[PDB]
Amino acid sequence: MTEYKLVVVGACGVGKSALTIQLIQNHFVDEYDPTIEDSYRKQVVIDGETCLLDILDTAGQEEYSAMRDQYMRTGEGFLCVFAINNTKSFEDIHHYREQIKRVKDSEDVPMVLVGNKSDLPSRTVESRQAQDLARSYGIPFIETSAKTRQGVDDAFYTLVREIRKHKEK
Amino acid sequence: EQMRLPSADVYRFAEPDSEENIIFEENMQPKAGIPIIKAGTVIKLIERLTYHMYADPNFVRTFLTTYRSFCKPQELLSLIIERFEIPEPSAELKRFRKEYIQPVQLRVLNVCRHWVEHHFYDFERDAYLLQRMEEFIGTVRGKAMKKWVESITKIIQRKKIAITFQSSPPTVEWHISRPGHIETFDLLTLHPIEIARQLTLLESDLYRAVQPSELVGSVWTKEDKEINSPNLLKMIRHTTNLTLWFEKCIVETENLEERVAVVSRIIEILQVFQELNNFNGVLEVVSAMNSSPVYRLDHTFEQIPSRQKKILEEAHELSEDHYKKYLAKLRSINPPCVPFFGIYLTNILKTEEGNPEVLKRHGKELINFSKRRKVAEITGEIQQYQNQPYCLRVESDIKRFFENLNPMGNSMEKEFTDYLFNKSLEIEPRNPKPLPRFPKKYSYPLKSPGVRPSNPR
Numbered sequence: 036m037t038e039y040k041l042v043v044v045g046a047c048g049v050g051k052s053a054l055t056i057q058l059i060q061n062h063f064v065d066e067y068d069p070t071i072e073d074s075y076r077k078q079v080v081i082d083g084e085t086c087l088l089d090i091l092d093t094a095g096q097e098e099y100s101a102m103r104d105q106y107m108r109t110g111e112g113f114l115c116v117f118a119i120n121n122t123k124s125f126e127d128i129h130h131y132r133e134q135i136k137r138v139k140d141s142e143d144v145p146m147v148l149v150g151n152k153s154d155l156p157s158r159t160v161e162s163r164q165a166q167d168l169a170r171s172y173g174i175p176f177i178e179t180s181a182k183t184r185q186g187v188d189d190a191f192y193t194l195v196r197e198i199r200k201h202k203e204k
Numbered sequence: 205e206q207m208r209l210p211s212a213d214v215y216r217f218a219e220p221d222s223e224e225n226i227i228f229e230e231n232m233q234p235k236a237g238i239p240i241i242k243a244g245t246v247i248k249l250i251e252r253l254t255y256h257m258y259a260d261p262n263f264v265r266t267f268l269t270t271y272r273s274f275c276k277p278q279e280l281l282s283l284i285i286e287r288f289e290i291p292e293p294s295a296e297l298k299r300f301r302k303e304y305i306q307p308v309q310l311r312v313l314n315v316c317r318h319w320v321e322h323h324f325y326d327f328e329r330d331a332y333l334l335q336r337m338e339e340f341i342g343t344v345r346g347k348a349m350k351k352w353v354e355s356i357t358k359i360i361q362r363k364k365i366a367i368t369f370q371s372s373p374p375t376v377e378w379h380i381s382r383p384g385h386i387e388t389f390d391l392l393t394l395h396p397i398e399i400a401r402q403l404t405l406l407e408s409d410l411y412r413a414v415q416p417s418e419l420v421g422s423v424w425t426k427e428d429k430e431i432n433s434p435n436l437l438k439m440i441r442h443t444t445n446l447t448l449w450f451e452k453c454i455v456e457t458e459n460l461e462e463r464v465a466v467v468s469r470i471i472e473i474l475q476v477f478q479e480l481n482n483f484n485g486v487l488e489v490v491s492a493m494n495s496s497p498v499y500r501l502d503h504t505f506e507q508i509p510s511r512q513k514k515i516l517e518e519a520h521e522l523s524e525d526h527y528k529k530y531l532a533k534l535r536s537i538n539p540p541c542v543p544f545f546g547i548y549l550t551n552i553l554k555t556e557e558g559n560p561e562v563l564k565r566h567g568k569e570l571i572n573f574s575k576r577r578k579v580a581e582i583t584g585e586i587q588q589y590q591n592q593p594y595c596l597r598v599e600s601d602i603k604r605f606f607e608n609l610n611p612m613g614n615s616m617e618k619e620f621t622d623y624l625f626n627k628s629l630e631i632e633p634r635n636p637k638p639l640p641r642f643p644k645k646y647s648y649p650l651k652s653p654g655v656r657p658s659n660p661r
């Protein structure tokens with residue numbers, strides 16, 4: 036069984052947490068203990084291939100700015116996450132992408148852009164702006180809603196598909 | 205023979221327990237045999253905080269550490285005053301005074317004592333809250349209460365007001381820089397043992413200054429982080445600064461042989477951090493070596509003696525598989541130590557984000573208390589490593605040298621880390637470019653004095 040090591044990156048105040056939490060937890064238990072091993076590992080079937088996702092989300096450790104390289108080097112694939120009501124988190128994406136390319140020493144690193152919607156303030160980043168950025172990078176864009184589970188599987192599964200397309204070549 | 209309290213119309217805490225106001229976990233409270241509260245209405249939580257049948261220190265601590273997400277301080281004080289003021293509905297009455305009113309009043313007083321002793325910041329931040337506490341306490345009448353009333357008053361007064369060892373710490377170690385010659389101090393001129401000792405002291409004090417109030421509610425991630433989590437932030441900035449200093453020391457040493465000495469010395473400091481159980485120190489080194497400017501220096505790494513490769517690799521491996529070996533190692537050592545804080549931060553954040561603030565039962569909203577318990581377990585684990593200090597003498601010049609370290613200078617983050625990376629590229633270019641030579645910058649000897657104490661004692 037193939038194992039994909041995924042890393043979530045993005046600014047604080049964004050629901051990077053909520054994205055990974057909502058993937059891992061069963062859809063109808065709003066419960067989560069991050070101190071146990073099953074909290075970051077999930078078995079899933081994607082395009083008929085059963086596989087194991089291992090998701091690193093360092094949400095809360097954004098201030099340890101010098102540890103980012105270390106954490107990023109552990110991943111094969113990256114979700115670059117911004118909040119659709121925080122323009123700054125969207126403008127910071129360019130920087131996270133550059134750092135990932137430098138850490139992985141590669142111009143073509145499996146990657147998806149994720150815009151997450153939680154609660155107010157209202158939207159400041161139109162999905163068009165994000166599609167345009169994603170397109171300039173040659174990567175998928177997925178928009179998600181934390182609270183409703185919408186988009187969450189799509190974001191992670193799309194990244195896995197990006198890794199599979201990268202591994203073929 | 206039950207008890208018979210007043211009507212729920214005249215006293216809100218008389219309301220019976222039901223599925224709509226209080227629910228419990230399956231398991232029972234460790235050491236004490238008390239039911240574990242899962243959720244309840246704020247009225248029911250306050251009833252249980254001050255329960256007549258028994259004392260609940262665990263619940264008191266947990267509640268007082270975490271209540272602010274669901275109840276304002278002023279509201280809490282109002283509620284416990286309401287709790288305290290028990291009307292009467294002489295066989296039934298003497299029993300009721302002695303087995304309900306007096307126990308409950310004592311428990312309220314105990315909450316007040318704990319609140320003021322351990323969470324005085326509520327009062328520092330809201331003087332009117334202290335005003336109300338003081339005039340409530342002055343109101344309290346009975347002779348049964350006097351002792352606790354006087355003790356509370358004594359704590360309040362103490363709180364309004366503005367190191368030596370068990371036996372001998374080891375002798376301070378000097379290498380090339382002599383005592384007092386702060387101008388000469390650098391990575392290679394101070395003794396690697398003493399670098400690790402003095403950084404451990406700094407980092408220990410930084411770890412110990414962080415309070416639960418800086419952590420509960422994930423406040424270090426919010427827009428007021430500098431107001432609410434200043435000690436946590438100073439601690440993290442220290443760590444970041446040292447990591448960056450190590451990277452800088454490495455990549456600005458352009459001569460290969462000298463750079464090998466530099467990296468080698470940093471691994472020696474790591475070894476001492478490891479001996480001291482300074483895990484923050486361990487990881488500030490590991491982070492430097494995994495940084496993009498350092499990690500790529502294959503010509504430097506090739507020349508690191510095999511012993512030190514293994515030391516570094518063991519340390520790196522603590523971080524692998526989501527800190528699996530770090531976690532096990534920390535459980536197994538006794539204080540003093542300096543934990544890596546980041547894990548606690550992520551656990552607290554995900555606990556708060558990953559669980560609902562309330563649960564609903566028969567259409568009624570109950571405060572999810574088990575979520576708060578989980579957060580209080582993490583802050584409790586943090587506090588257990590804060591009690592025991594290191595038996596090491598402070599050296600005030602070496603301490604000052606590391607406090608005033610500023611590898612970034614006036615530069616912003618991006619500018620600085622681009623500078624380190626470009627520097628790495630210059631000193632060891634990408635294949636297929638040949639490796640240049642560079643002149644030596646250090647006019648003193650590079651040989652380490654090693655990591656064993658120089659003298660006996």
Ligand SMILES: NCCCc1ccc(Cl)cc1
Nearest residue numbers: 467493498499501504505
């Ligand atoms: N396997 C490479 C280890 C990463 C590393 C560590 C130290 C230095 Cl100087 C260069 C690279």
Ligand SMILES: NCCCc1ccc(Cl)cc1
Nearest residue numbers: 490493494516517520521
């Ligand atoms: N599990 C071996 C990984 C190899 C490695 C990676 C990073 C550093 Cl700092 C040292 C060794």
